[PDB]
Each structure stands twice: as structure tokens, then as C-alpha cells.
Amino acid sequence: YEMDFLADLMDNSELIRNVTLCGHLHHGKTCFVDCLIEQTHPEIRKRYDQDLCYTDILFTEQERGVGIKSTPVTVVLPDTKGKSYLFNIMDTPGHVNFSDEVTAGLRISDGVVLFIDAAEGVMLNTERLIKHAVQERLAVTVCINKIDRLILELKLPPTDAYYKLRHIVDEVNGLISMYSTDENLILSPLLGNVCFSSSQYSICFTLGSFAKIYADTFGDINYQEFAKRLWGDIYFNPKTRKFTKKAPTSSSQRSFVEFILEPLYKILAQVVGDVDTSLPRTLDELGIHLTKEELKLNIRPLLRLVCKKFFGEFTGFVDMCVQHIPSPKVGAKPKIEHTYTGGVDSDLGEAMSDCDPDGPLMCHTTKMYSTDDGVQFHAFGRVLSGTIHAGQPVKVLGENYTLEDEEDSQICTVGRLWISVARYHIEVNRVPAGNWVLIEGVDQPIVKTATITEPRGNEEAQIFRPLKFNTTSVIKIAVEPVNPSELPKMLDGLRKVNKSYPSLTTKVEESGEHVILGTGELYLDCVMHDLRKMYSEIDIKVADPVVTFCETVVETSSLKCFAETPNKKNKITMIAEPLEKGLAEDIENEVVQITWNRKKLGEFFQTKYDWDLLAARSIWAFGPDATGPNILVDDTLPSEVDKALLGSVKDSIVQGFQWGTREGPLCDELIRNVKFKILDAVVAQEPLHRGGGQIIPTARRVVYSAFLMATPRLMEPYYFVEVQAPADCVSAVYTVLARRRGHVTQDAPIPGSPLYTIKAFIPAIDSFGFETDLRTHTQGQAFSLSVFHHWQIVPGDPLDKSIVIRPLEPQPAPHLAREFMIKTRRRKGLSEDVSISKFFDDPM
Amino acid sequence: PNVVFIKTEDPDLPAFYFDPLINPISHRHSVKSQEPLPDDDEEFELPEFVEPFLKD
């Protein structure tokens, strides 16, 4: 590959495809791309004993194995027979928190690739990832890595292996059909959306490349006529000399079984066994003529060499990445329709709808990458429209930016451009559209999200929606320095690391604590390592973890919280009650949004929520930030009369509710499952006394009086631990879960290999080392993984001043709720004597 | 990656023997292809003008 040819192909056409991989716990990714780099960069030779990564440029992934830094790479891959294409592949880690990171980073790719283990098969990360990708409306191209782990490790026959693959594809297609009704992408076992890989042994090909091999050596026309029936349920008929999809003979297997798997196992058994005897007799028939010095290797590298000579240059995956993974000229429409805040009806929408390098520029930086000098970190981003050049200034923008809010803008000169390779970097002077560039000089004004427009002429430009994660981070940790005279360096490192890891979010509570919010234990571990080692060289102290809780109403309020305004001209009354859990999960799952007609919300409430007619028609407002489950309501006999004046002072009431839900009196945390119904609301005709000064805080007082005087109850999170392990480890996992507040959800003998997958919940309070405790007693055979996606109410009722956990015991009583209440109010600095029920009762 | 392996008993069994150890293959019942497939005319027009894969 010549860099000049790369530049020529860059500003050539939309043939350059954009892809982002997807996998879980080493199921096919960095070894596969190491094979790709060896195919493209021949001088970069892989080792003999140890595996070569080519994706963990940093050190933490090398020392742990679990990748953290998504290292995208772009390669000249002449894998299309008689053609060539450009591929922009975004490598991805596999861990759950890092899976949320990838899901945040999957906005860029027009399509998605999956690497599933041939033996382990489906996992939990994929169970979430399929749903996430279908929610983003991106392409899907399944692939299966670690196939040598099936033929060699298990020593299965062909038919059992093919049935295993059938079951894998059936489960994947069922999950996709449950996610949505994408008939175009669904049902893809043989159309080209199935790649094969043995990354450790470079055994990687597809149906098309297989048919191409046979047509090249001694064969017939291409796979358009042959590969259309190599899939099972159709055997070969040497009598008729064709594939008998009708009733076949007895001693016959599927064309996959006898054309592909037969010689596959043949050469595997000839290279592994009989390496001294059956090597040349089997290799001079179809293989290479490697010298005697080449046969003096161990079994693994020799096998990899033979697999590489067989699949000569891996001309199989470009044949599918161009097939179904669309070009950027095609994917610009839906990607922008889903990402851009406005619709396609905007001038900028139809402008950037095509990948015009000469037009309104709309860049978007997602992942921030550091350099050898920690004081300056670059930024990677997808150029959807326009053409960036060296030294061109751009209007960097923020997530809070808006057409009216011109505060989140800051100009900056693009210093030096690079190309993402993760081992080297190619400097660039001009960048066309559909491009990934390593931006320099823009490191300062960047936030977790980033959007770019032209510094002049790009006016009337909206921004891209803030990305989701599909995994709400619940962990809360404090990080205070060793010596207190090191605050600014620690905070600078904290900000740099925040810009590095988008999943987290800095915070400083009223108690003056330096707080961090992580998704998992290993997430916070890698974060603090990169902090103390890279972004801040100061010795820092660390506390223990704690889960960020929320409040909930156990039942209806007893009395009407009458929070009257201080002007003696506003008497608000809000009675709060809970709602169905599934409806709140759907409101959080973006099922029933707020921007709908009155009839639309009415039908949604009468069908989904099963609410009353006037009840649903009287919808007041939504929850905090229009994303959380906080239902506002306003219905009454005088409410139907004087709703106009109150409607004038309803915006301030909704704002006060949204700001009060952000921090409640229970534990200074969020609130959920609250249906605040406003019954009595005196509204004065004079807006001077009835202004905002007696709108926001009176409403906040009423809301807190209803939430505190209506049988409160906390809500602690529950993870979902899927531990693939044998039966003895199953009993051990039962013991540990019983000893740590567990709840056995599902446990079954997952086929394909002996790994009984134990699916069960763990609370975050008792999740401090679930993986460590499971791997300690199970003798290293129960590598489970957790994901926080289920919040449940603790059984305590922390209102009675009778239970007190004085000593350092772990609150075995059902006063554990009050224990966590006292602990949280002591950690937050607020008044630990939470007795505002009589103070906030507001008697009248 | 829990290293899976099938530790056989003695070297009298075949090489690739399904050890009754793991589970049923799929226990599938939704597949319904008792009747012949539609790719018949082009199938007859789709010969196999090449020697087999590894018959020898």
C-alpha cells in the first residue's frame, strides 16, 4: 500500500466504507485485525509465541488484556477480487462499561460487525449490543471468530458443528426480530453477512471467497450460481451432478459439511497430526511449497502459515463489507436523521444529506485521544460534510449549545491533521468528506460530545443529539488527594480523563468531595490508573464505592402538601402517587416521548398505561430533563376552570419540579415512580406577586412535602451477572449469591461447550467484587460479567427513629435502608437528622 | 477464555467423536423444510464442474 494511492483513493468516491467492530471478552477482534495488519503491512511481522495486539497502543490493555482505548485503523485492503476498496475500521473493546463506551462510539460507523465465539456463542454484551445497534438503525454483518477453538478444542464432528452454527444464527435472528422488524438486514445466513475467522491461526474466509478459490484453482463460474445453495438443507447429487434440495440420498451431508468442513478438518488433521508423514502428500496437491526450514516450526505457527497461504490474502471480508455495509453516500441520510437535532427538512439536513466535500461543513468528534505529551490530546471525528484542511479554523461547539444559546462556541485553528493507524500516523494537508482525522490544537474547548461548523457562512446550523449509552452508570466514588495542597493538578488530570472517558462525569457535591461516576469496577480502576499515571502525577487517596440511589413513593400521600407562596397569594397543593413500573421503564427507554399531540398521548395512556380519558387528556408535563420518570399532573374541578392563569405560571412550576427531582430530601439523589397531581393551586391575577419568586420554590416545597409524606422508599440497583462455568462452579455461584443478597434468575447448560450459564441479579451494595469472589472459589472457571439495568426498591421504611446501626456491622436488619440513609447524608454533608416531614408539612 | 477441551478416555475412540458431555445440539423444531426447495431450475442449471474438495 502506497500512501499516495491512499490519498488518491480518499478523494476518489464513496467506495470508502466506514465500519466499527463489535465484540465481547476476546471473541475475535484484535487478533483478527493483527492478521489484517500483517496482510497490509508485511514488514510488521507477528511473533511466534505471544499474540500481537495492534490495538492497545497504551499499556493498561497490554497488562490486563481487556482493551479500553478504541484504536481505529484505516487500511488499503485489496480484498475485493479484481478490485480494491478503503475501509475505516473502528476497533472496539468488549467489557460491559467499555461496551457502553463503544455504543457511544458506534455513531460513526455506517454499519456494524460482530465477532462471536464459535464455541461460547452469544453473551450478555451482544444481548445488549444487538438491541443498541437496531435502535441506532445501522447495518449488521455477522462474523464468527475463534473457529479453531471449535474444531481442535472440542474435537466435534462436522454435522454437530454445522447445527451449532445454525443455532447461533437462529438465536441472532430471533433477537434481531425481537428488537425491530428490519426485514432487509434480518435473515442473513448466506447472503454475504456471515464471515469466518480463526484470528490466532488466520483461518478466515467466506462463501464467496471459497467459491472464488475453487473457481481459480479448478472450477466453474463464481459464487452467484454455486454459493446460493452451499448452505444446508440441500445435499450434493453426483448422479444428477447438482445440489439435490429435494429428498437426497442416505450417505450424504450438506454442501457446507462436505465441501468446506471436510477439507478444513482434513488439512487441520494433516498439519496437526502426521506433520512429518502426511504434510507434503497433502500440501503438494493444493498448498504451497514452503521450504524445509519452514516445516521446522511448531504446530501453531506452521498451521497459521498454511492457513494464510490457503486464504492467500484474505479476499473474503471486503466482499461483504461493500455488499451490505453501505457507503457513506448512502448512510449519510439515516445517520444524520438519527444524530442531528433537527430533521431532514432543514437546509443543513438536505445539504449534509449528501457527502459533498464542497458545502456546509459538519464534523463531529466523538473519541478524544491522547499523545506522548499528556498536556495535549487530539480528537478523532467523522467528517460528514465539507473538507477540512491544515490550518483551517472551525467553530467548535458543545452539547448545551443551541441556535439561541451562543455561549458554548469557541474558535480554534486546526493545527496538524493525521490519519488513525494506532501504530503510526500519516500527516494530511487536505481531507475530503467521509473521513476520520486526528485533530490537533482543538483540545481545549472540547467536551464529552463535539460538533463543528464553518467559522463563517455555516450559520443556522443545529447540532447532534447527545449520545446515549444503554447502561446507566450507578457507581459513586470519591477521590481526594493525599496531600490537600495538590488540588489543581488533581482537578486538571480529572478534567483530562473526563474528556478521555466519555461514559463518566465529574461532580462536586455540597460537601466539597471530588466525586467520580463509573459503570463498573474495572472501569473506575482503569480510569484512576490513567489519572494517577498519565493525567496527574500526584499521589491521591481513594475511598470505597457507593451506588447512586433514588427515591420512590411506596403508596399514596396521606395529606395534601399545601405549600403556600410567601406572598400570601399562591396556595399550591400536589398529591403524589406511583405508577406502573413498565410505563416508567418505557418513558426512560424513549418509548412514549413528550413531543406528541394530545390525542397521541391520550391513546398512549389509554392503551399502554390504561389511564382514563380526561386523565390522559389532562397530561401536565414530563420528568426532569424530559428523560426521567417523573409524571406531573393537574386535574380538578376548579383546575378545569382557572387553568389559564395557572397555565401562565405553569412553566415556572414545571421548571421547579424538574430542578427538585434532580435532588430530593431522601438522600440528595434522584426520584422515580412519582405521579405528582396538582389539585389545589391558587393563581393570582397580578403577576407581580404571582411571579417566579413564588412559583419555583413553592412548587419545590410542595413536591418535597408530597414525596416525603407519602411512604417513601429508596431504589437500589441490581446488576445482571451471566457466569459461564461448569456445574461445580454453578453450586459455588449459588452459594456466593445466597451469601451476597443474590437472586437466581436463570441457570442452564448452555450448549456448544460445557459452560452452565448462570444468569442472576446482584445488588451494587453487595457487588463489590462479584467477579473476584466468583473467580476465587471456582478455581478460575467462572469469569462472569455484570450490567446495571434493573432498579428495585429496598424493603426498608427509613422514617421511624427506632433503628440505629451504631457499631460497624453491615446492617443485617431491614433497617439497612436507614443505615444507607445515615451513611449517605454523612457522606454528602447535609443534615443527617432528616426530619423535615414536620418542617415541610406546611400546615394550613 | 476458559480453555475448553475434551479429555477422552483412551486412543480407541475416533478422533472427532461427540462426547456426550455438553448438551443437545440445538433441540430445534422450528425448521420446516420437509418439502423440496425452490432452487431447482437454476440448480439443474448450476452444475459442479470441478473435482471434489478433499475426496482423496
Binding site: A727, D728, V730, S731, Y756 | T8, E9, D10, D12, L13, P14, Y17, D19, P20, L21
Partner: peptide, 28 residues
């Protein structure tokens, strides 16, 4: 040799079935 292989397969299948029955009884 073929009959020996079939008998060995039957014996290993019986042994694995007994072991799996014991393991499943313990797990239940």
C-alpha cells in the same frame, strides 16, 4: 477395530451419563 471403537464409545457414553446424572442431581 470398528466394533472395538463402537464398544469404547458406548462405555465412555455410559460413564459420562453416570457422571452427568450425579452432577445434575447435585446441582438440583
Amino acid at each position: 477395530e470398528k466394533e472395538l471403537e463402537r464398544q469404547a464409545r458406548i462405555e465412555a457414553s455410559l460413564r459420562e451419563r453416570e457422571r452427568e446424572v450425579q452432577k445434575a442431581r447435585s446441582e438440583q
